[PDB]
Symmetry: C3
Subunit: 224 residues, 3 copies
């Protein structure tokens, strides 16, 4: 029944899903060590650290392609869409916002939708790298990987923003779960582009997103 994958490919991420990636990234950034004290004594550094979690994919993909990183800041609709979630995750009265979204079902849905935004970011970078370099496989893998787990790769300098400098925790030394999955996804969809992978994009799109959501759901379920 390939008619269902065609319906899944018509999804738009501007309203609902972009907020889910921004919320899951800001909440996961708050749950990190010493992030509450940053927002309590320095809202500017905690906000910029949240933007590195939300738009880290577009920032790294722009720096690697010699594209202006301020161009991501031009979309005032998206920047304000993530800043409002940041202010509510940290500075909501009675912390009713975080306590509501920390609930297990709501946290599963929000995180699972961020996994969906990761897919289109990978394909965005792969097709965008194709616009700059035609059949260069390594460029498309790099930019698609840069948009999939951008915040995970700038995580070393993102830690430097909040104040913690950990030179021993490099992403290439121990590839974390999201970064290595984005690497696998970037390679697969580059072969999907490259036509070396015998499957349509939309079917590979659906099965990779499902294989990603199912794992993180299982992780968040087996963790609590």
């Amino acid at each position: 029944l390939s008619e269902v994958s065609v319906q899944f490919s018509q999804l738009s991420m501007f309203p609902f899903f972009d907020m889910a990636h921004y919320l899951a990234s800001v909440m996961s950034a708050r749950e990190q060590a010493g992030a509450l004290d940053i927002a309590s004594h320095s809202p500017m550094a905690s906000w910029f650290s949240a933007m590195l979690h939300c738009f880290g994919g577009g920032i790294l993909s722009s720096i690697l392609l010699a594209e202006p990183p301020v161009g991501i800041l031009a979309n005032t609709t998206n920047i304000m869409l993530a800043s409002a979630i940041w202010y509510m995750v940290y500075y909501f009265p009675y912390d009713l916002f975080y306590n509501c979204f920390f609930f297990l079902p709501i946290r599963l849905i929000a995180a699972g939708m961020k996994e969906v935004t990761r897919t289109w970011k990978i394909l965005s970078g792969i097709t965008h790298a194709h616009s700059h370099y035609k059949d260069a496989w390594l460029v498309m893998i790099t930019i698609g990987w840069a948009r999939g787990a951008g915040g995970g790769l700038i995580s070393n300098f993102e830690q430097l923003v909040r104040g913690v400098w950990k030179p021993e925790s490099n992403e290439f030394l121990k590839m974390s779960y999201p970064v290595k999955v984005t690497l696998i996804g970037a390679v697969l969809f580059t072969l999907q582009h490259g036509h070396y992978l015998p499957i349509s994009r939309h079917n590979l799109m659906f099965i990779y997103t499902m294989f990603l959501v199912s794992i993180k759901v299982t992780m968040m379920l087996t963790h609590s």
Copy 2:
């Protein structure tokens, strides 16, 4: 009497004022902790650290706009104009140069003129961001702020140049005086170009520069 602000808007900064910003930035870089030993044992690192104080506004504004940072190095007239001040601040015979400009009236004039160069840098980055992005308010604020206090934002990596690594002293954690004033100035003049602020450009230019020079003059006076 708005006829005086029109006369003030006609200042050219190429001869006198650019040297004032370069001198105030190089001298303030020397007075930092452990800067004399850098120039005495490694003139290369102290010179580059001085260039990050002088041209830090243009460097950060070029990196944010994907513009070549080496383009700032193209103006050999400006680079030599700051390197000559660097060599005289550190390596002048009998230190007659620094001892002359460390005098309170001369230090007040040189620093007060750097406050004037900060204004045109803010407006240069706001109008330059307007050339790249029409009515994007956040881009004009970012680039105008990047040229106002550029050396203050790269201060973390500028410290890494001389050899001091302070991951705890982030500019976003505690906003210093010059950086936060440039932020206020970048926001005000951005509302001016967007015509959201009910005042002419020339008058807002003059009152902001005066409000800036008067504060630093008061600071340098109340400090000695």
Copy 3:
């Protein structure tokens, strides 16, 4: 006998010599402190650290000229030509690869040919900076120097890749031998393109390459 310098001005570096620079850079990167443990437990970090040694010249010259650093990754022939040397230097059976190239005559030839690749990289960056900026001397010096000893200037962040952070060992504080030689070469050949240096390009090319190979051969001979 200027008839021999013309025959030398004609070496093509695509087959033999590019592998020599990649081999000498990867082997010298392995001989660094704690580099074997990186490749044994984190092949991704050791590979990227090896690429920063091989293509650090092109990477830094691209970042300084606002050119896409991923553009160096487009040449899959050159990237695979260096990654194969990386895998054989580290993961060859019985380490027969490193033990063969660590032999003194073979190590002298491989390192001496990397010194030849350094020459064309300096001239590549000088002529490339001439294409972006006509008679800008400082830009031609910077880019030619950026291609000559690129891995030596990103060495601070390259150390951050493998996991070691030394904020005290800056290249400008104590200029190493290869970096300061590339600076001298970048200045000499910049005076050549500007015709301020009374010598033909081909002759200055040959005498500078010989003066560089003879020194490193003497160093490797007096070190063992």
